[PDB]
Amino acid sequence: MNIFEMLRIDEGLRLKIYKDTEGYYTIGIGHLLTKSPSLNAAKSELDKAIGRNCNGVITKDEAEKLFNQDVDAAVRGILRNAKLKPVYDSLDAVRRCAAINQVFQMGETGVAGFTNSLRMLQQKRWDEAAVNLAKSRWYNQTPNRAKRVITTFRTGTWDAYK
């Protein structure tokens, strides 16, 4: 297991434009296109992302290209965030994956605001952090995934991803 295999499980792979769990146009391995309800706006974002006229459809190679960019961008975002960087750097590699997973799904600005969870994670109070992480919209809206990510934060193992 690694961050790519983890997010591949959590996000799936679809080659045609679809709506994510929040109802937003997405493609590939959880590549959010736009929050616009206009399919044409999503198609424009897709074509811009891929660099050709896609007509709402991409290849597996293209999906994987966006995925690598998105994972990279998530990590670099964490590293430039003054609240997230020290916590991220305090973690072991497996728990870092859980952190990347959350940021990939929820975005950096929101996650940087989870002040109490962040503190518990930096303190390595794992069971407390796990309890705190579940007290969230995130957990309520995507509980199966959140349980996996939380187990990863709690244990520093890949037990939830087998």
Footprint on this chain of ligand 268 (rule: CB under 6 A): 78, 84, 87-88, 99, 102-103, 111, 114, 117-118, 121, 133
The nearer residue to ligand 268, 42 or 111, going by C-beta atoms, is 111
Active site residue 20: yes
The catalytic residue among 20, 47, 64, 128 is 20
**Least Å distance between CB 35 and ligand 268?**
22
**Least Å distance between CB 146 and ligand 268?**
10
**Least Å distance between CB 91 and ligand 268?**
7
The catalytic residue among 10, 11, 62, 70 is 11
Residue ranges of the annotated binding site for substrate are 32, 104, 117, 132
Closest to 100 (Cα-Cα) out of 82, 116, 85: 85
Per-residue buried b or exposed e for 100-138, using 16+ beta carbons within 10 Å of the residue's own CB: bbbbbbeebeebbebeebbebbeeeeeebbbebbeeeeb
Question: What's the CA gap between 122 and 53, in Å, rounded?
Answer: 45
Report helix angle 93-106 to 60-80, nearest 10: 100
Point out the residues that are catalytic. Answer: 11, 20
